[PDB]
């Protein structure tokens, strides 16, 4: 019965083998975020930036990378709640989809998609992007970029996300650091509109104290435990 909005971040995919910017040193795969996740960075050195996303995109599809029990629990939660569930993720991986979730809002885009730099049309894309790869949507073919929202760019699906933040009865943030905005501010919006807020994390987030209920530990243990608790509670 309750409307449940889940926000996930990089932590949920850590046990699956996917790393992210660890704000301790502000390095993602030992690259400064300035250089690999800004429009400037892509303007300055598109070869390096495309190579970086090519590496991430290849690594995501390696056999050792699999959804973990936290991802599966969120698919079970959607199964239980149907249209009264929405999953928003900051993650660019496809592990929620592999677990069985549908209608996932990727507010920062998707590593397995690219975008025409001219038209904005989005393409599924599982391989490398090379300079020879141009769009097929424009008369004058244009370069393709990762369909990944960079720092300084506007996230995707925000109107729907803000609508769900208001509508939610329960807002659960899973695996988020509390350092990336606007996502890190969602808990405030959820609280403003009356939701019960839950943090599930390995490490308490910067904004952890804003959450009403919280559980910490490995995601693969904590998230299934919480989903079980929630579904039991809902009857």
């Amino acid at each position: 019965k309750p409307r449940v909005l889940v926000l996930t971040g990089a932590g949920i995919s850590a046990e699956s083998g996917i790393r992210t910017f660890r704000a301790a040193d502000g390095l993602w795969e030992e690259h400064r975020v300035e250089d690999v996740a800004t429009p400037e960075g892509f303007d300055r050195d598109p070869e390096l930036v495309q190579a970086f996303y090519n590496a991430r995109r290849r690594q995501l599809q390696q056999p050792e990378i699999q959804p973990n029990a936290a991802h599966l629990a969120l698919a079970k939660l959607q199964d239980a709640l149907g249209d009264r569930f929405l999953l928003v993720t900051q993650n660019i991986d496809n592990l929620h989809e592999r677990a069985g979730n549908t209608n996932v809002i990727h507010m920062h885009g998707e590593l397995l998609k690219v975008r025409c730099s001219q038209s904005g049309q989005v393409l599924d894309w599982t391989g490398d992007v090379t300079p020879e790869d141009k769009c097929h949507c424009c008369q004058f073919p244009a370069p393709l970029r990762p369909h990944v929202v960079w720092f300084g760019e506007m996230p995707l699906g925000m109107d729907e996300i803000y609508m769900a933040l208001s509508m939610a009865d329960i807002f659960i943030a899973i695996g988020t650091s509390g350092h990336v905005y606007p996502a890190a501010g969602f808990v405030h919006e959820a609280k403003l509109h009356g939701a019960h807020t839950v943090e599930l994390n390995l490490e308490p987030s910067q904004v952890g104290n804003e959450f009403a209920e919280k559980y910490y530990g490995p995601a693969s243990q904590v998230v299934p435990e919480f989903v079980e608790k929630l579904l039991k509670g809902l009857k």
Binding site: F21, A23, G26, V33, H108, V149, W150, F151, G152, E153, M154, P155, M158, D159, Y162, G178, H179, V180, Y181, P182, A184, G185, Q206
Partner: peptide, 9 residues
């Protein structure tokens, strides 16, 4: 709403 993607600090 929300502004652009940005890191604290």
């Amino acid at each position: 709403k929300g502004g652009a993607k940005r890191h604290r600090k």
